[PDB]
Paper text:
Titin is a protein expressed in the skeletal and cardiac, or striated, muscle of vertebrates that plays various roles in muscle structure and function. Encoded by the gene TTN, titin spans half a sarcomere (the basic contractile unit of muscle) and has various functions including preventing sarcomere over-extension (Gautel and Djinović-Carugo, 2016), acting as a molecular ruler for thick filament formation and as a hub for numerous signalling molecules (Kruger and Linke, 2011, Linke and Hamdani, 2014). Fn3 domains are only found in the A-band region of titin, where they are arranged with Ig domains in a pattern termed super-repeats, which themselves are repeated. Fn3 domains have a characteristic beta sandwich fold, with a core of hydrophobic residues as the “filling” between two beta sheets that pack against each other face-to-face.
Here, we present the crystal structures of seven human WT titin domains – Fn3-3, Fn3-11, Fn3-20, Fn3-49, Fn3-56, Fn3-85 and Fn3-90 – and two domains harbouring rare missense variants found in patients with HCM: Fn3-3 Arg15908His and Fn3-56 Ser23226Gly. In addition to the WT domains, the structures of Fn3-3 Arg15908His and Fn3-56 Ser23226Gly were determined to a resolution of 2.10 and 1.43 Å, respectively. The two rare missense variants have each been identified in 12 patients of an 874-patient HCM cohort at UCLH, with general population minor allele frequencies (MAFs) of 6.5 × 10-3 and 7.2 × 10-3 for Arg15908His and Ser23226Gly, respectively, suggesting they may play a role in the patients’ disease. There is usually a positively charged residue at the Arg15908 domain position, and the Ser23226 position is also highly conserved. The two variant domains, which each harbour a rare missense variant found in a cohort of HCM patients, closely align with their respective WT domains, with the mutated residue incorporated into the domain without affecting its conformation. Both the Arg15908His variant in Fn3-3, and Ser23226Gly variant in Fn3-56, however, result in the loss of polar contacts, and this is reflected in the loss of thermal stability of the domains. The other four variants were folded so we compared the thermal stability of these WT and variant domains using differential scanning fluorimetry. The melting temperatures, Tm, are shown in Table 2; briefly, the WT domains had Tms of between 59.8 and 74.3 °C and the variant domains had Tms between 46.8 and 66.9 °C, with a reduction in thermal stability ranging from 7.4 °C for Fn3-3 Arg15908His to 13.0 °C for Fn3-90 Arg27839Gln. The high melting temperatures for two of the variant domains (66.9 °C for Fn3-3 Arg15908His and 53.4 °C for Fn3-56 Ser23226Gly) suggest that for these it is the former, as previously characterized variants linked to disease via domain instability typically reduce the domain melting temperature to below physiological levels.
Numbering used by the authors:
A (entry chain D), E (entry chain A), F (entry chain C): 3 to 103
B (entry chain E): 4 to 104
C (entry chain F): 3 to 102
D (entry chain B): 2 to 103
């Protein structure tokens, strides 16, 4: 009937100089319609614009962000989409630095 | 004394007739170990909370069954020790009883 | 360039009369440098002092606390460290009773 | 261009009576790029599964007195924010709160 | 019917060497019965036991703690009571040092 | 003996085309020393840099941000300082648009 609530508990792992593994939990409210997938966005320091990380909807609760530039800091957020619309983005993750560890 | 509520109640494997719930233990056990958990659900179109499990669930997960296809459900979980039962966790849902994804 | 933010969602499992397994998620902000490891602290009821549990940094997101006294209640908190410094401790977990 | 704002936060109550309650909240942390025009207050009674609009016109303030409560009943409350782009998700739910004198 | 939920958003102001002004918001859930009042407790560092500050229930949403010792650090928590019982305490405030601004 | 915790519940009111009134609550933990004051920072969209708004520490729990440009979006955060050091900034407030209500 309506858009779902935001995904919750966005977290990270496997941070490298060029990628990072994001993980989250599903919305607490689906808005009355099943979740079709998720939209991952990232924002780099030095730019005020949020970029889409996945082209097609991600049906998983995890996603590997790629294309990171070494030494840069990045913010991350993830939204959920159903037939009714797209949720507000989760709470922002980051700044996380693109370094090997 | 009674423990604090369970935290971070989440879901997975939503079907037309069931859903897998998962949570984390209380941050405070009130001075006595947790004996188990009490799972409750509430359907839309009805104002009463129903007990899902008969005996206490000692695990941190539980499969709710007996859902009606297409209906929306709320969920909450409490923790019990020798002293009493905690307040319920944060409410999960509305979640629609449909085969997800 | 600066200290990271606290670890988040500190939780517990596998509580025994002498040990407990702690688990957490990494800081939301690393302060510009990778996380080197974590510092686990505990505080017993009947004492107002926080104690370090691990000597060397824990690079993992989990750690088994040992040496607990039967029947006692304990508080727990974990911090993250990078080359710049140590974060504020996470939200306090506990009191958790040391019983099987 | 713009988008809906984030939900109002910290919805709380005061002056609970047999027939009314004073609701209070804080503005969204994100306005979506356009000023907040006002707020939409909703309530849900126990014994009914439907959310009801309490105010007809938008409330521009950060407070609003809900009236028409039935003595002894329990009520849930939530508030949303609206700008030119749309209406936010409702805040976290307040209640059940019983309409009774101390 | 049942005990209320904990008071929320416990905060402070007007910290002195002998007192502090506490303020909070009412429970999100009253358990089906009005809140009769609140119970303020404090715990000093160097002592492991929580002490009751007020004898009679406080019907207001604020209360001035007195009798603090200069230089000492204190923890604070507040509970709500209705005809059914007393809630879990709010989130703990402090350590706050008993010193003049 | 150590820095305080971040200020909490940073909120806004009286948004205009050139100013906004910020308000917050004191740290939950003062680190064992009184709070000397607060440091207010803002960041404009289209720029990745946080700017200090106040020169001298603000002892109050509120502050009027000025110098905003009409139509621009701004982020805000506030830190607390004692004799031991400066806290991590509070949770970020914004984006909030500089426009007359």
């Amino acid at each position: 009937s309506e858009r779902p609530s935001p995904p919750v508990n966005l977290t990270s792992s496997d941070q490298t100089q060029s990628s990072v593994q994001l993980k989250w939990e599903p919305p607490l409210k689906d808005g009355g319609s099943p979740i079709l997938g998720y939209i991952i966005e990232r924002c780099e320091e030095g730019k005020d614009n949020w970029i889409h990380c996945n082209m097609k909807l991600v049906p998983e609760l995890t996603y590997k962000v790629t294309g990171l530039e070494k030494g840069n800091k990045y913010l991350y957020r993830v939204s959920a989409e159903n037939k009714a619309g797209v949720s507000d983005p989760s709470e922002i993750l980051g700044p996380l630095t693109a370094d090997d560890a």
